[PDB]
Design an enzyme around this catalytic site. Structure first.
Site, PDB file in Angstrom:
ATOM      1  CB  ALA A 202      -1.022   0.016   1.243  1.00 13.08           C
TER       2      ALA A 202
ATOM      3  CB  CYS B  24       5.807 -22.790  32.524  1.00 14.47           C
ATOM      4  SG  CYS B  24       6.882 -21.858  32.976  1.00 14.47           S
TER       5      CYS B  24
HETATM    6  P1  LIG Z   1       2.413  -4.285   3.300  1.00  8.47           P
HETATM    7  O1  LIG Z   1       2.798  -5.584   4.026  1.00  8.47           O
HETATM    8  O2  LIG Z   1       1.153  -4.267   2.669  1.00  8.47           O
HETATM    9  O3  LIG Z   1       3.707  -4.177   2.204  1.00  8.47           O
HETATM   10  C1  LIG Z   1       4.926  -4.644   2.246  1.00  8.47           C
HETATM   11  C2  LIG Z   1       5.254  -4.953   0.950  1.00  8.47           C
HETATM   12  O4  LIG Z   1       6.839  -5.110   0.781  1.00  8.47           O
HETATM   13  C3  LIG Z   1       7.259  -6.455   0.455  1.00  8.47           C
HETATM   14  N1  LIG Z   1       8.415  -6.831   0.846  1.00  8.47           N
HETATM   15  C4  LIG Z   1       8.724  -7.011   2.399  1.00  8.47           C
HETATM   16  N2  LIG Z   1       9.969  -7.394   2.477  1.00  8.47           N
HETATM   17  C5  LIG Z   1      10.405  -7.327   1.415  1.00  8.47           C
HETATM   18  C6  LIG Z   1      12.065  -7.656   0.734  1.00  8.47           C
HETATM   19  N3  LIG Z   1      12.906  -7.752   1.735  1.00  8.47           N
HETATM   20  N4  LIG Z   1      12.093  -7.224  -0.171  1.00  8.47           N
HETATM   21  C7  LIG Z   1      11.298  -6.950  -1.155  1.00  8.47           C
HETATM   22  N5  LIG Z   1      10.065  -6.652  -0.900  1.00  8.47           N
HETATM   23  C8  LIG Z   1       9.356  -6.892   0.335  1.00  8.47           C
HETATM   24  C9  LIG Z   1       5.981  -7.471   0.613  1.00  8.47           C
HETATM   25  O5  LIG Z   1       6.051  -8.440  -0.126  1.00  8.47           O
HETATM   26  C10 LIG Z   1       4.848  -6.477   0.481  1.00  8.47           C
HETATM   27  O6  LIG Z   1       4.430  -6.312  -1.046  1.00  8.47           O
END
Ligand SMILES: *P(=O)(O)OC[C@H]1O[C@@H](n2cnc3c(N)ncnc32)[C@H](O)[C@@H]1O
Lengths: 294, 976, 76, 76
Positions: B421, B574
């Site tokens: 987003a 625990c």
């Molecule tokens: P939200 O979870 O809506 O957006 C995060 C997006 O970033 C992408 N993403 C997370 N971590 C990485 C890395 N290490 N490299 C490239 N893209 C990343 C997620 O896939 C979500 O699209």
């Protein structure tokens, strides 16, 4: 020189050393030549690391190279990978006048990439293939319990602290709170039942179980199949004190042969005594075969 | 009901009641400029019942600066009519229509909330009076260059059901005093966290049972661990137990009408370093209408001194209160322009206000909000000749920043990490800004694919785009919105494994990096890369209505890694194993049981089946690992292998019996229920809940649900066809015989024997397949099994059960997210990006952002300067480094440092590796000394050096000539 | 002197502090009352981030002023 | 008069309690040094229990005696 003096002088040099735990493999991969519990987590972590982790680990290594506890009663030995400071193995000998006395207990320590913000992960390996629960805080699956190892709400003095807490603190906490002379009362709620005959009988039963458990796993299996990192230290420790372990086990046997007040505890105590005799015969057989170290 | 498969993330922010209320509200939006477009987009993504787009102005070239749904071919058409077709595709559950007629009184009666933009003063006053007289919520929003104005009037009596949006906190009582000022003490000295004047309710109280289910009582916090509830002498004595839970009290407030609130305004402070700004901005915005009326409806010319003086005179004549004349002049100078990030931020805020009006959740603005971003302008200002329009789609932007800044933007190259987003909003804002449209470029990367739940907050994706890569789809969408944008998209995950593409040369030509990730490891890696390459980085993060922006400038500010965030809260061993007392513990236990039963128990068997030579590899493993693997393989393939679905049902019944009867009986045998400590407190008291074994009942829906889910999952693991019939499951499970249970107080030969057993009895024709936990699919029975397991364990310990919604929220580690927060945070981040591109270096200009749209709240602060340290009298920060060139041996490296920097290296490391140390074995030290540093790195890291690697990073711990440790900057080793 | 600290989540904190005390003391009091360690606290006042080693007099924190305890987030 | 009570750092410190002091009084006099609640403390002598109702004289604890104080040791 006295035997205690020779022990202290001989094992001082080998408190903190490095071992080849990881060797090169094909297609730019690596494989473990020693059995480490956190191998899967090491592979999952990969090359991730916090910037402060390297400085924290360097300071920790500097501290451990000189400040590891050492005495005739108990000692701590730490081995780290020759190329990775975040992979370690810890050997702790049981304190005297405890059910763990003169017993070698092995732990696997892995420092997560978020260290020192997250507490390190430690797992007990001397569990007899998950068939022995050596302590209420040492579950038979290998998990080790300490308040210092928790980031849970708790109390600010008892929690894992990014600044004050350290690996040596965790080792001392294990040595002082887990290998207590009376492991039965470590469980909360049971601590206040001490002084009663029923509590004394329960503690005697638990101690009798732990006696044979330690004789089998912490001594006999360590002598027969020592870890590659802790081979020579274990050999030296068991050779230098063999009369002491023999006398202590004989005293344990004499203590277990005393009459018991309740039949329910008496049957278990007798069974544990027979098991301990069976294990002590084998231990005496193995001790005589120890070639004296150079 | 609410379609959870689409609004799953938004439900955890809003709630079922709030979403139901918004499903019955009609919205009217007047004015379809950039700000109106953002408001409408966010409202539609929110999921209101219907929205009507009304506009009278026609599309022009100046509108293309912020309106991403209008093209050059739309010039001359009505903005609302042209944008309605594209606005409808965002959400099919929302009915969108376009209206062009006058805003008559009868027409206004059909809308719950009315939003007015670009309306004149008389129309604004008339509509505000009509709305206040007829109980219709009204919101007025305007944007003039780098300024904003928001007004809210929700009626004479507005009721808020959740003032802050925080979940209630429950604490456990240890003792209650029995007197006229009864004092409640929490358990084992744990902080309750209750605020002063809170309302709480009591349950599970023994002795003072009158307090159970009582009406909320006002409390007085007497300390971090004690509080008073008043007179408790009328009830019985307190024995033990009890849980006190916070209760959210609704609040009713009154909104003044616009005609009254103009003279006595209440300002919501946007920046706490500009407390006097809203007072001047109110007068400036009020006098803008008078200036327009006095100049044939024409705004002041961009950066014109005469028009600024005329506007200042108008402001002086209009009001008698003292105002900041310089601020008025600046406002008049840049009032005629328009920019995209400001429109996005104000649109997000106004859309959140519309949602608050519709649902009654969160506290609205009371009553005016004024915001500015004057730090984006150059310190010396913009020459009037530079701000003249040039017949381009960025004319409204040149009216603010000038043509030179447009040229700088066209040549800028920026890298966006993550296309979620925040990533999509950043991409839209960058495309609308004209960034990279010349010789520059916009790089975007993402390793994930589009999911249905992502469409709720990501407006760049469509229902027919599911299973497509996020980065490419977003790139194509923003290419459609603005044809001049040059975008390169990648499907890679940033890290050490993708440095082949994101090499040092790739970061060398970059001008900045914008972070839109959802994890800390990627953030740390991007910080390290930005520090090494010395480029600015902008960090954004959101959590529900919360959000923050951090800006990192090379040689100026500290890095994102310089500070630390609270660690992830772990569960005590625990509490997870034997003594749960909250639903989170049972949910984690259920997740662990699912993993251990359906995934970890089959991986070894699947590997053995797939790989014919698996046995010879696992025979060489050190320690007892070969036995631990062969025994698990045998157990999975021979002992527990079900030959029919009936065997699966029997296994599920037995597993239920062990998990909820046998282990609990053993636990009770170890600790009797009535065990009493010497001093008086029972063992099963406080945080410890006494469990009770369950009795299996096929008529109980929970037991049947667990049996059904477990049997179906077990059949899926072994390839047996699933039987999705509840009646058949109930019939089969009644024939299972449960064995009685009672509580209880050569290795080479073994491996050879087990290998023989596998090669003789085990069959390689099986279809062992471990299950991967998937939460967004409702047909895989993963969530059903998790819910059944957690609820059964809760019923074991008398813990209140949780529905599927809370179980999915907790077990699945769902991060709640909404579109408005994303828009606001992306707008702020793009503002900081503009500040960086301008060329600002003083930390006063830059501002870290923090926002909570629920309160609402938003504040700014200057980024902290980099920490300074000294060695041998030389100052250094985290941006400084040593420069070592050429190829040298390890001994040459140490000698170089010793001779030049007078530092004796005691520990040399490369990443997680350790090349040199004072405690290393002497043989290895002698071996590594003559070798080149590249060869030493290759040997230690157990990996070859890639051709794209032109340099290496080393961390050194050094001792000065006097023998004490000193902190020194890292070393950049340039390969030849 | 009595000051207020408002968390980003909207909860209000009341502290009893005389001027001249080092931030470290302010963070210690906030830790005693809520429980966050001192290195995890970010105090914002008048557009400035309070740093260790300084006193309230430098930041001109007087009676009845409000501070802000903000935190960073990991979503996106 | 002076008897010794164990502390966190392993060391044993000097405190002014009486044999006629109840264990509640001993806990209060330990509390006045660091604010530690009386209920957190478990006074112990050579591994044997001490609790609030008794006084030190019932366990013959007097001048020069040491108390192994452990703060109601917690667990997993
Ligand atoms: P939200 O979870 O809506 O957006 C995060 C997006 O970033 C992408 N993403 C997370 N971590 C990485 C890395 N290490 N490299 C490239 N893209 C990343 C997620 O896939 C979500 O699209």
């Amino acid at each position: 020189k006295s035997i205690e003096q020779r022990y202290l002088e001989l094992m001082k040099k080998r408190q903190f050393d490095t071992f080849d735990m990881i060797v090169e493999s094909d297609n730019n991969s690596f494989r473990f030549v020693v059995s480490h519990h956190f191998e899967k987590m090491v592979r999952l972590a990969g090359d991730r690391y916090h910037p402060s982790r390297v400085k924290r680990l360097a300071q920790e290594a500097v501290t451990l190279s000189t400040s590891l506890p050492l005495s005739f009663s108990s000692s701590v030995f730490v081995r780290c990978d020759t190329d990775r400071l975040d992979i370690m193995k810890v050997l702790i000998t049981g304190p005297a006048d405890t059910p763990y006395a003169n017993g070698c207990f092995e732990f696997d320590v892995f420092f997560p990439p978020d260290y020192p913000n997250q507490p390190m992960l430690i797992n007990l390996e001397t569990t007899g293939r998950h068939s022995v629960r050596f302590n209420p805080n040492l579950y038979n699956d290998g998990k080790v319990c300490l308040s210092v190892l928790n980031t849970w709400h708790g109390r600010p003095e008892e929690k894992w602290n990014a600044q004050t807490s350290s690996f040596l603190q965790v080792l001392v906490s294990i040595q002082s709170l887990i290998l207590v002379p009376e492991p039965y009362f470590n469980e909360p709620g049971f601590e206040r039942s001490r002084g009663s005959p029923s509590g004394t009988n329960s503690s005697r039963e638990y101690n009798s179980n732990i006696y044979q458990a330690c004789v089998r796993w912490a001594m006999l299996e360590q002598i027969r199949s020592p870890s590659q990192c802790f081979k020579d230290v274990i050999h030296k420790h068991f050779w230098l004190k063999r009369e002491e372990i023999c006398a202590q086990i004989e005293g344990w046997i004499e203590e277990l042969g005393k009459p018991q007040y309740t039949e329910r505890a008496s049957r278990t105590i007798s069974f544990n005594s027979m098991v301990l005799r069976r294990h002590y015969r084998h231990l005496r057989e193995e001790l005589s075969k120890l070639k004296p170290p150079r | 009901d609410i379609d959870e498969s689409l609004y799953s993330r938004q439900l955890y922010v809003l709630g079922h009641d709030a979403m139901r209320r918004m499903a019955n509200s009609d919205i009217l939006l007047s004015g379809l400029g950039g700000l109106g477009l953002e408001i409408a987009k966010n409202v539609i993504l929110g999921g209101v019942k219907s929205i009507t787009l009304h506009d009278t102005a026609t599309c022009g070239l100046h509108d293309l600066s912020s309106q991403f749904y209008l093209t050059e071919a739309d010039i001359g058409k009505n903005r609302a009519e042209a944008s309605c077709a594209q606005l409808a595709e965002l959400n099919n559950y929302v009915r969108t229509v376009s209206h062009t007629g006058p805003l008559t009184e009868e027409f206004l009666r059909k809308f719950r909330v009315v939003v007015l933009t670009n309306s004149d003063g008389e129309e604004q006053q008339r509509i505000a009076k009509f709305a206040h007289e007829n109980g219709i919520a009204l919101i007025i929003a305007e944007t003039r260059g780098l300024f904003a104005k928001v007004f809210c009037d929700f009626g004479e009596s507005f009721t808020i059901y959740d003032q802050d949006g925080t979940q209630p906190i429950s604490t456990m009582i240890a003792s209650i005093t029995h007197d006229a000022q009864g004092v409640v003490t929490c358990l084992d000295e744990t902080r309750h966290g209750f605020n002063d004047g809170d309302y709480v309710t009591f349950s599970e109280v023994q002795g003072m049972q009158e307090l159970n289910g009582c009406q909320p009582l006002k409390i007085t916090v007497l300390g971090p661990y004690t509080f008073s509830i008043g007179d408790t002498s009328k009830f019985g004595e307190y024995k033990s137990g009890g849980v006190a839970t916070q209760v959210k009290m609704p609040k009713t407030i009154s909104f003044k009408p616009l005609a009254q609130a103009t003279e006595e305004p209440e300002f919501l402070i946007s920046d706490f370093a500009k407390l006097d700004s809203p007072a001047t901005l109110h007068v400036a915005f009020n006098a803008l209408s008078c200036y327009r009326k006095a100049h044939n409806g024409a705004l002041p010319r961009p950066w014109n001194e005469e028009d600024a003086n005329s506007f200042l005179e108008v402001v002086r004549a209009s009001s008698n209160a003292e105002v900041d004349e310089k601020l008025v002049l600046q406002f008049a100078k840049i009032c005629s322009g328009n920019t995209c990030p400001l429109d996005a931020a104000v649109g997000g805020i106004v859309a959140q206000e519309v949602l608050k009006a519709c649902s009654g959740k969160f506290t609205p603005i009371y009553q005016w909000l004024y915001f500015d971003a004057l730090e984006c302008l150059p310190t010396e200002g913009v020459e009037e000749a530079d701000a003249q329009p040039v017949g381009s789609r960025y004319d409204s932007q040149i009216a603010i920043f000038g043509k030179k800044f447009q040229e700088k933007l066209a040549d800028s190259k920026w890298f966006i990490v993550g296309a979620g987003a925040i990533g999509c909003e950043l991409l839209k804002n960058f495309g609308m800004l004209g960034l990279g449209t010349g010789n520059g470029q916009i790089f975007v990367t993402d390793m994930d694919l589009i999911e249905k739940s992502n469409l709720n907050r990501q407006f760049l994706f469509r229902p027919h785009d599911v299973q497509k890569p996020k980065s490419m789809t977003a790139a194509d969408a923003i290419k459609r919105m603005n044809p001049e944008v040059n975008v390169t998209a990648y499907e890679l995950r940033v890290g050490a494994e993708t440095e082949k593409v994101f090499s040092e040369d790739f970061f060398g030509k970059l001008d900045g990096v914008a972070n839109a990730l959802d994890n800390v490891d990627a953030r740390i890696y991007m910080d390290r890369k930005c520090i090494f390459n010395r480029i600015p980085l902008v960090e954004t993060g959101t959590l529900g209505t919360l959000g923050n922006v951090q800006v990192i400038v090379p040689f100026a500010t500290e890095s994102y890694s310089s500070s630390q965030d609270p660690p992830e809260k772990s569960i005590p061993i625990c509490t997870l194993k034997n003594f749960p007392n909250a639903i989170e513990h049972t949910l984690q236990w259920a997740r662990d049981a699912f993993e251990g039963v359906f995934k970890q128990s089959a991986e070894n068997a699947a590997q053995y089946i797939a790989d014919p030579q698996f046995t010879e590899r696992i025979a060489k493993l050190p320690g007892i690992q070969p036995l631990e693997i062969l025994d698990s393989i045998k157990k999975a393939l021979i002992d527990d292998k079900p030959k029919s679905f009936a065997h699966c049902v029997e296994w599920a019944r037995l597993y239920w019996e062990d998990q909820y009867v046998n282990q609990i009986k053993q636990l009770l045998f170890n600790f009797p229920p009535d065990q009493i400590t010497s001093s008086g407190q029972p063992f099963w008291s406080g945080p410890k809940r006494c469990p009770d074994p369950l009795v299996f009942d096929v008529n109980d829906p929970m037991h049947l649900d667990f049996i059904y889910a477990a049997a179906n999952l077990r059949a899926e693991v072994y390839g047996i066809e699933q039987v999705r019939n509840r009646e058949t499951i109930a019939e089969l499970v009644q024939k299972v015989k449960v064995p009685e249970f009672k509580p209880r107080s050569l290795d080479q030969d073994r491996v050879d024997k087990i290998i023989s057993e596998l090669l003789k009895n085990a069959d390689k024709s099986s279809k062992i397949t471990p299950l991967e936990f998937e939460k967004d699919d409702d047909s895989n029975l993963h969530m059903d099994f998790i819910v059944a397991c957690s609820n059964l364990r809760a019923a074991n310990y008398k813990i209140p059960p949780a529905d599927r919604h809370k179980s999915k929220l907790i077990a699945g580690k769902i991060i709640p997210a909404i579109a408005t927060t994303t828009s606001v945070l992306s707008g702020l981040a793009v503002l900081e990006v503009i500040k960086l591109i301008v060329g600002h270096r003083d930390l006063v200009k830059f501002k870290n952002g923090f926002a909570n749209l629920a309160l609402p709240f938003m504040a700014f602060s200057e980024p902290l300067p980099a920490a300074k340290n000294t060695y041998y009298g030389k100052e250094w920060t985290l941006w400084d480094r040593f420069e070592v060139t050429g190829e040298l041996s390890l001994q040459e490296f140490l000698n170089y440092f010793e001779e030049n920097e007078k530092l004796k290296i005691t520990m040399l490391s490369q990443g997680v590796s350790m090349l040199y140390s004072f405690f290393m074995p002497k043989a290895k030290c002698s071996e590594r000394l003559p070798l080149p540093m590249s060869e030493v790195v290759r040997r230690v890291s157990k990996r070859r050096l890639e051709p794209h690697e032109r340099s290496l990073v080393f961390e050194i711990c050094c001792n000065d000539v006097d023998g004490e440790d000193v902190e020194v900057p890292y070393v950049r080793y340039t390969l030849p | 002197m009595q000051i207020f600290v408002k968390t980003l989540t909207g909860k209000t904190i009341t502290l009893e502090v005389e001027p001249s005390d080092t931030i470290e003391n302010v963070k210690a009091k906030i830790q005693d009352k809520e429980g966050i360690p001192p290195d995890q606290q970010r105090l914002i006042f008048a557009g400035k981030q309070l740093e260790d080693g300084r006193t309230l007099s430098d930041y001109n924190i007087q009676k009845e002023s409000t501070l802000h305890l903000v935190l960073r987030l990991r979503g996106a």
